[PDB]
Design an enzyme around this catalytic site. Structure first.
Site, mmCIF file in Angstrom:
data_model
loop_
_atom_site.group_PDB
_atom_site.id
_atom_site.type_symbol
_atom_site.label_atom_id
_atom_site.label_comp_id
_atom_site.label_asym_id
_atom_site.label_seq_id
_atom_site.Cartn_x
_atom_site.Cartn_y
_atom_site.Cartn_z
ATOM 1 N N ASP A 174 0.846 -1.182 0.000
ATOM 2 C CA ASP A 174 0.000 0.000 0.000
ATOM 3 C C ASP A 174 0.888 1.241 0.000
ATOM 4 O OD1 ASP A 174 -2.714 1.201 0.283
ATOM 5 O OD2 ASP A 174 -1.891 1.927 2.183
ATOM 6 N N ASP B 119 -1.930 -1.410 5.416
ATOM 7 C CA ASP B 119 -2.101 -0.872 6.765
ATOM 8 C C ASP B 119 -3.533 -0.407 7.011
ATOM 9 O OD1 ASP B 119 -1.992 1.509 5.156
ATOM 10 O OD2 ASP B 119 -1.500 2.634 6.975
ATOM 11 N N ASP C 224 -7.556 -2.242 2.295
ATOM 12 C CA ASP C 224 -6.775 -3.407 1.889
ATOM 13 C C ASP C 224 -6.796 -4.451 3.003
ATOM 14 O OD1 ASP C 224 -5.196 -2.052 3.689
ATOM 15 O OD2 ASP C 224 -3.590 -1.593 2.271
HETATM 16 MG MG LIG Z 1 -3.159 3.034 3.551
#
Ligand SMILES: [Mg+2]
Ligand SMILES: CCCCCCCC(=O)OC[C@H](COP(=O)(O)O[C@@H]1[C@H](O)[C@H](OP(=O)(O)O)[C@H](O)[C@H](OP(=O)(O)O)[C@H]1O)OC(=O)CCCCCCC
Ligand SMILES: CC(C)CCC[C@@H](C)[C@H]1CC[C@H]2[C@@H]3CC=C4C[C@@H](OC(=O)CCC(=O)O)CC[C@]4(C)[C@H]3CC[C@]12C
Ligand SMILES: CC(C)CCC[C@@H](C)[C@H]1CC[C@H]2[C@@H]3CC=C4C[C@@H](OC(=O)CCC(=O)O)CC[C@]4(C)[C@H]3CC[C@]12C
Ligand SMILES: CC(C)CCC[C@@H](C)[C@H]1CC[C@H]2[C@@H]3CC=C4C[C@@H](OC(=O)CCC(=O)O)CC[C@]4(C)[C@H]3CC[C@]12C
Ligand SMILES: CCCCCCCCCCCCO[C@@H]1O[C@H](CO)[C@@H](O[C@H]2O[C@H](CO)[C@@H](O)[C@H](O)[C@H]2O)[C@H](O)[C@H]1O
Ligand SMILES: CC(C)CCC[C@@H](C)[C@H]1CC[C@H]2[C@@H]3CC=C4C[C@@H](O)CC[C@]4(C)[C@H]3CC[C@]12C
Ligand SMILES: CC(C)CCC[C@@H](C)[C@H]1CC[C@H]2[C@@H]3CC=C4C[C@@H](O)CC[C@]4(C)[C@H]3CC[C@]12C
Ligand SMILES: CC(C)CCC[C@@H](C)[C@H]1CC[C@H]2[C@@H]3CC=C4C[C@@H](O)CC[C@]4(C)[C@H]3CC[C@]12C
Ligand SMILES: CC(C)CCC[C@@H](C)[C@H]1CC[C@H]2[C@@H]3CC=C4C[C@@H](O)CC[C@]4(C)[C@H]3CC[C@]12C
Ligand SMILES: *[C@@H]1O[C@H](CO)[C@@H](O)[C@H](O)[C@H]1NC(C)=O
Ligand SMILES: CCCCCCCCCCCCCC
Ligand SMILES: [NH3+]CCC[NH2+]CCCC[NH2+]CCC[NH3+]
Ligand SMILES: CCCCCCCCCCCC
Ligand SMILES: CCCCCCCCCC
Ligand SMILES: CCCCCCCCCC
Ligand SMILES: CCCCCCCCCC
Ligand SMILES: CCCCCCCCCC
Ligand SMILES: CCCCCCCCCC
Ligand SMILES: CCCCCCCCCC
Ligand SMILES: CCCCCCCCCC
Ligand SMILES: CCCCCCCCCC
Length: 1000
Positions: free
Chosen positions: A412, A705, A709
């Site tokens: 990410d 994080d 996601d």
């Molecule tokens: Mg993020």
């Protein structure tokens, strides 16, 4: 994608299933249809249990409810309702397909109470219920492993053979492991239910007025929420019908920037929310505010509920998704052969039937260790403790093994690779028609108007907070600013108007009143006097916006009168900075041929700039943006490739990703092989990409994080979360420290477990197999080892060496070579077979040498196996085998390059030394432990020295064999049949692109 519906017989099925005692495996085996066919008692219209094939088998209960009859069933979190018009089940999400935007507007007024009840019965509650299961349900579900059944069978046999202690040990190990497994699975499910749980008091209007207040569970698609003026979380998916709002869709895109959502454009044509995404409010996104400007309040019509929402789809995908260590044919046939040999020789050596059956049965447990999985998992516990000693916390230790064979990592962007926020890069003063050079930190500037505007104009909004922190002018007429010059007080101010993105503030100091306006570059420049605004505002602005930065214009005038006549004082540029430790980690992964990928919900420009900056794309590597126009219905979709400034790299977009998935399946592998940046990815699109990459025979991990996601983390082979909330629920790993450094360290640890696992496995197999040979030898002469001998082989020797060979840690560096990915590899099989040829040679040589002595007398075979002891053959064979176990345990373990050298773990070497000392004492020292262990006390010193020489020969042979195999088998394998052409799909694709890159 077909189905059927089934309607006393349960008792017969229950009796037949319970009576067989193994039919559950047969039902759980390839043919499960018969088990359902008999039990379900076989129409779709008339049924009480449904079966569906997915072309796969799935069984569901036909739930029902009264409204005045309803029949519905759930599957993968999606509800389906039975309809009498077509006499078939239909997914509720498609019940109202292609609703007109005017039809949506017709529900501006709320929903009648009768319509609310009936429509709730159709769609169901708005909650996302996690079906948490009771302990017996989890037991029958996640603890049906056939190995546990084999362990129970071995336990029962051992209790039937007076081998109580090892049976108790295995029982304790298996029971404790099962209990912890069930407990942690339930704990994970409970935490997931809590995370997805939502509860609010939401206002809903009615056509009869008097807007009621209800729970989130009661919302159904068709009533409209009165969005609060202040804000709060959005209970479901909806479409704005009156007013405008500012939303925080960090749950979907991963960014916390405010996003404007306006009312739905009234008219005909269907509402999809794929093209009306700018006028729809999604579940979970935080509403900063809602301003109406028309009518008494903001209105948003519900469209989806429960699992139908985007968050509902994500959670549904989350809920509904070595390996070769369980080879079956070789072990089964060998155990069978040994058994039939045992019955043959035993009927040749007349002994009672019950003894014959027990002896024949025990050889299978000798062949297959019931303690194998426990030996495998010790190293994963070691790795888990090592990781937990340095931040990273794991829930499933066996997953750590996948870290060893990981070869692709997705990252990410916001929060993971870059700081979770923007920071000042500098201010850009301009005197005439030319910008002065960008200043790194705004502190070093004159005391002119520009610094005053940088210090004063704000709503005090992370953006203004960052502005004031960098300039350093501390706050204390609505305020008085202190520089670290003059105290500047704010004489007047105006709110930051959401529609027209301007913010003005009027200030004065002890030294005329002066106004400062902060806003977007182009609009504020249009507001300013063209005399002061420079000619090249368009190129300096495309230079910053195209590079992922965000510019803000400062204008001023010495005092509608305020936001009129303006002149630009400068531009402040913001960037989402790379974390201080991402480039070393990214380059460390890259130099070991571990592929790094960026998978972001951000725009493409910021993604590519960050990718180039952090080192995922080297300055010398090409990079191409692939764009796929949507099918216009007059011409099909066609891909178009735009290179940029410059291994090839591809930057795929979000909608273009879906377009490539749908309309170009054949070209998707080629793009996935050489794609490095994936921007504008939906939460489901990340999971789709992960699944497709896994279909290319990759071992993919991802280090997200945020909340968006989470499906990708669940789907990834090795998921790591840089956040103690909203993502640790699904991730197998979670790091307290929030940076990319957790990724490499995990890989190193994984390699140890994947290496240690191999060695442990190898020892256990050997441990088993050599024992089997020895048992056979004694069984050839109507003899057995002995209870104390069996215990001294199974408890102390195996446990000590097995646990102590797993202590070793990694080598502190990441090499270019991966460990072997398969226990059935040629080197592993060759090593076991050669080691056993050596071991059998030594054991048989000892047996044939002890028969050629003046002092030897054979055992009498008229007596049972255990009553022949103490005995010459038994003590000789036991003496050889006992040393052989330690010899193999020492020789099998390895050091570099995946583990520390084998001489570091002093406890293991010291354990080997003490075990060898007591064993040589048993062979040599007369009558100290030969009472318990029925040994016959060889009196001839020369023969004892010969036995010692034989075991030394085994020692040197095993070590030299391992060394020469490891240092000369790859060369022989490569020199024979050099045309390898590896079968993994991604390696093959690399070769096709390498010879002929398909995109010219
Ligand atoms: Mg993020
Ligand atoms: C009785 C069956 C034995 C096992 C058969 C297994 C098949 C077999 O041998 O692999 C091909 C080997 C080498 O292959 P091997 O080392 O056994 O492992 C294979 C490849 O090496 C491949 O890697 P690369 O292609 O190097 O990238 C990858 O590692 C796969 O294993 P993984 O799951 O761990 O990833 C296997 O497809 O080729 C020879 O080096 C000549 C040997 C000729 C001898 C013939 C054996 C009959
Ligand atoms: C390797 C071989 C010997 C397999 C042994 C498996 C055992 C570890 C299993 C068999 C029965 C299981 C038990 C079955 C039922 C229960 C009842 C359960 O208590 C309840 O009755 C309430 C459960 C609820 O309401 O959710 C607590 C767990 C326990 C003791 C289970 C714990 C695990 C046990 C002992
Ligand atoms: C009696 C039979 C059933 C044998 C049972 C063996 C146990 C006594 C073993 C199995 C797992 C072992 C544990 C496996 C892993 C660790 C991690 C280990 O942690 C480290 O040393 C690394 C961390 C660091 O030093 O940085 C400390 C010992 C401990 C708890 C071990 C202690 C001994 C245990 C409980
Ligand atoms: C009837 C007679 C044969 C008694 C046998 C008793 C066994 C149950 C004892 C003998 C030696 C013991 C072992 C000796 C040493 C260790 C090392 C110990 O190591 C650690 O605790 C971790 C070390 C680290 O992490 O560095 C774990 C328990 C274990 C395997 C012990 C488990 C219990 C054993 C097998
Ligand atoms: C011969 C030497 C014997 C060594 C004896 C000492 C070691 C004893 C360790 C027993 C295992 C305890 O460890 C526990 O085991 C079970 C299965 O094995 C693992 O269970 C595993 O499968 C279940 C699903 O089936 C997963 O949910 C769990 O994540 C996974 O790790 C537990 O996650 C692990 O925590
Ligand atoms: C030749 C004769 C004497 C051998 C008889 C041994 C039988 C009883 C053994 C051999 C393998 C064993 C099975 C191995 C696997 C399983 C799967 C488990 O989910 C149910 C128990 C079950 C089905 C075991 C029950 C006992 C078993 C069937
Ligand atoms: C009656 C004949 C076949 C003799 C019995 C042989 C037994 C020991 C065989 C029959 C089927 C075998 C099992 C088949 C499937 C698996 C895979 C995995 O889950 C662990 C090993 C395990 C569980 C095997 C262990 C050995 C096994 C249990
Ligand atoms: C001497 C005879 C009775 C054997 C008894 C051994 C007992 C004490 C063994 C059996 C299984 C073992 C446990 C297996 C799993 C774990 C998880 C690990 O993270 C911490 C240690 C812990 C909790 C072990 C501690 C020791 C243990 C409880
Ligand atoms: C002490 C008496 C009873 C004999 C037993 C000692 C054995 C177990 C010990 C003595 C010193 C040890 C060696 C020390 C150094 C190395 C180099 C390293 O690459 C691992 C193998 C090897 C070669 C070790 C294997 C185990 C070893 C040979
Ligand atoms: C083996 O069996 C008998 C049992 O009494 C034992 O005494 C003797 O040593 C052996 N028999 C012969 C004939 O040697
Ligand atoms: C290296 C393993 C040595 C095993 C020692 C066995 C000791 C057994 C204790 C005595 C039990 C039987 C006495 C009647
Ligand atoms: N490694 C598992 C094999 C265990 N075999 C134990 C056999 C014990 C035989 N005892 C016979 C006792 C006669 N009463
Ligand atoms: C818990 C491990 C077993 C130790 C106690 C049993 C010792 C062997 C006794 C043999 C009696 C014949
Ligand atoms: C005696 C069996 C219980 C051992 C302890 C289980 C785990 C404790 C975790 C704190
Ligand atoms: C029956 C002994 C149970 C030991 C495990 C209980 C869970 C400990 C906390 C994880
Ligand atoms: C055997 C009972 C103890 C098991 C837990 C040990 C944990 C030690 C942490 C260093
Ligand atoms: C039985 C006494 C030995 C236990 C092991 C001591 C710790 C060694 C690893 C630090
Ligand atoms: C009984 C086998 C374990 C002995 C370990 C001795 C301690 C070594 C660390 C200095
Ligand atoms: C672990 C293998 C031990 C071999 C012992 C050899 C005897 C050495 C003393 C003469
Ligand atoms: C016949 C005299 C003994 C020779 C034994 C050879 C083995 C030597 C082990 C050190
Ligand atoms: C470089 C690895 C050397 C290993 C030597 C093993 C043979 C040991 C002789 C006692």
């Amino acid at each position: 994608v077909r189905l059927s519906g089934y309607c006393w017989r349960v008792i017969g099925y229950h009796v037949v299933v319970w009576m067989m005692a193994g039919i559950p495996l047969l039902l759980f085996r390839w043919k499960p249809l018969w088990g359902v066919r008999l039990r379900l008692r076989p129409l779709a219209h008339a049924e009480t249990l449904v079966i569906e094939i997915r072309d796969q088998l799935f069984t569901v209960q036909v739930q029902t409810e009264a409204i005045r009859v309803l029949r519905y069933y759930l599957f993968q979190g999606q509800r389906y309702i039975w309809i009498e018009t077509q006499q078939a089940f239909y997914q509720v999400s498609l019940l109202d397909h292609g609703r007109s935007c005017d039809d949506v507007h017709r529900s501006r007024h709320g929903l009648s109470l009768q319509d609310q009840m009936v429509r709730k019965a159709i769609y169901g509650p708005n909650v996302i219920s996690i079906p948490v299961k009771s302990y017996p349900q989890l037991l029958v579900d996640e603890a049906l492993n056939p190995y546990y059944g084999f362990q129970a069978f071995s336990i029962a046999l051992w209790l039937a053979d007076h081998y109580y202690w090892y049976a108790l040990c295995i029982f304790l190990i298996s029971s404790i492991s099962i209990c912890l497994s069930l407990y942690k699975t339930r704990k994970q499910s409970q935490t997931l239910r809590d995370m997805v749980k939502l509860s609010m008091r939401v206002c809903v209007c009615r056509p009869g007025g008097e807007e009621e207040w209800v729970d989130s569970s009661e919302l159904v698609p068709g009533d409209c929420l009165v969005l609060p003026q202040e804000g709060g979380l959005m209970p479901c998916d909806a479409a704005l019908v009156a007013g405008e709002c500012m939303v925080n869709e960090s749950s979907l895109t991963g960014e916390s920037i405010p996003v404007l959502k306006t009312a739905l454009p009234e008219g005909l044509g269907p509402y999809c929310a794929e093209t009306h995404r700018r006028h729809t409010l999604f579940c979970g996104t935080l509403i900063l505010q809602a301003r109406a400007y028309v009518g008494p309040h903001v209105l948003a019509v519900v469209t989806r509920t429960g699992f139908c929402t985007a968050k509902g789809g994500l959670v549904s995908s989350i809920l509904h998704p070595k390996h070769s260590m369980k080879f079956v044919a070789a072990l089964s046939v060998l155990a069978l052969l040994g058994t039939i040999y045992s019955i043959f020789i035993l009927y040749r050596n007349r002994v009672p039937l019950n003894e014959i059956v027990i002896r024949a049965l025990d050889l299978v447990t000798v062949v297959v260790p019931p303690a194998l999985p426990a030996a495998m998992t010790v190293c994963t516990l070691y790795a888990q403790s090592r990781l937990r000693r340095q931040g990273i916390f794991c829930i499933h230790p066996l997953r750590i093994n996948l870290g060893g064979k990981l070869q692709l990592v997705c990252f990410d962007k916001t929060g993971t690779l870059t700081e979770d926020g923007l920071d000042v890069m500098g201010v850009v003063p301009l005197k005439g028609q030319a910008f002065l050079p960008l200043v790194p930190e705004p502190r070093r500037l004159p005391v002119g108007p520009l610094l005053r505007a940088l210090a004063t104009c704000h709503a005090l909004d992370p953006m203004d907070l960052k502005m004031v922190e960098s300039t350093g002018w501390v706050l204390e007429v609505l305020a008085v600013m202190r520089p670290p010059p003059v105290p500047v007080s704010v004489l007047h101010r105006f709110p930051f108007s959401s529609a027209l993105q301007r913010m003005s503030v009027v200030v004065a100091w002890p030294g005329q009143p002066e106004a400062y306006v902060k806003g977007s570059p182009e609009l504020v420049a249009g507001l300013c006097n063209p005399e002061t605004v420079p000619t090249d505002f368009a190129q300096m602005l495309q230079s910053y916006t195209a590079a992922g930065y965000r510019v803000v214009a400062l204008a001023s005038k010495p005092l509608d009168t305020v936001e009129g006549d303006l002149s630009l004082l400068g531009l402040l540029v913001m960037r989402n900075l790379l974390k201080p430790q991402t480039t070393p980690v990214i380059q460390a992964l890259r130099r070991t041929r571990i592929r790094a990928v960026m998978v972001t919900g951000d725009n493409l420009q910021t993604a590519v700039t960050v990718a180039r900056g952090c080192g995922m794309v080297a300055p010398q590597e090409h990079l191409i943006i692939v764009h796929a126009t949507h099918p216009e219905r007059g011409q099909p979709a066609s891909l178009e490739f735009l290179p940029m400034e410059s291994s090839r790299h591809l930057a795929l977009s979000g909608p273009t990703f879906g377009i490539i998935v749908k309309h170009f399946p054949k070209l998707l592998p080629k793009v996935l092989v050489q794609g490095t940046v994936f921007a504008r990815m939906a939460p489901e699109q990340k999971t789709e990409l992960v699944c497709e990459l896994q279909k290319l025979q990759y071992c993919v991990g991802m280090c997200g994080d945020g909340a968006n996601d989470c499906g990708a983390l669940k789907a990834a082979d090795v998921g790591i979360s840089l956040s103690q909330a909203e993502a640790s629920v699904v991730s197998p790993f979670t790091s307290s420290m929030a940076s990319i450094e957790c990724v490499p360290m995990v890989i190193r640890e994984g390699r140890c477990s994947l290496d240690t696992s191999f060695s442990v496995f190898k020892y256990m197999a050997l441990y088993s197999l050599t024992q089997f040979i020895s048992v056979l030898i004694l069984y050839t002469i109507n003899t057995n080892l002995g209870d104390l001998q069996f215990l001294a082989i199974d408890l102390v020797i195996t446990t000590t060496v097995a646990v102590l060979m797993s202590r070793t840690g990694p080598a502190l560096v990441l090499g270019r070579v991966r460990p072997p990915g398969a226990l059935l590899s040629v080197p592993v099989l060759s090593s076991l077979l050669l080691q056993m040829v050596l071991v059998t040679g030594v054991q048989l040589g000892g047996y044939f040498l002890t028969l050629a002595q003046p002092w030897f007398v054979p055992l009498n075979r008229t007596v049972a196996a255990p009553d022949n002891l103490p005995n010459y053959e038994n003590t000789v064979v036991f003496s050889l085998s006992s040393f052989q176990y330690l010899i193999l345990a020492a020789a099998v373990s390895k050091g570099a390059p995946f583990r520390r050298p084998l001489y570091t773990n002093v406890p293991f070497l010291v354990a080997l030394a003490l075990l060898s000392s007591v064993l040589v004492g048993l062979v040599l020292v007369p009558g100290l432990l030969q009472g318990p262990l029925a040994l016959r006390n060889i009196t001839d010193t020369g023969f004892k020295l010969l036995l010692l020489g034989l075991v030394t020969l085994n020692f040197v042979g095993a070590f030299m064999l391992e060394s020469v195999l490891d240092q000369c088998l790859p060369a022989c394998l490569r020199r024979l049949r050099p045309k390898r052409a590896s079968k993994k799909r991604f390696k093959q694709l690399e070769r096709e692109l390498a010879e002929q890159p398909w995109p010219p």
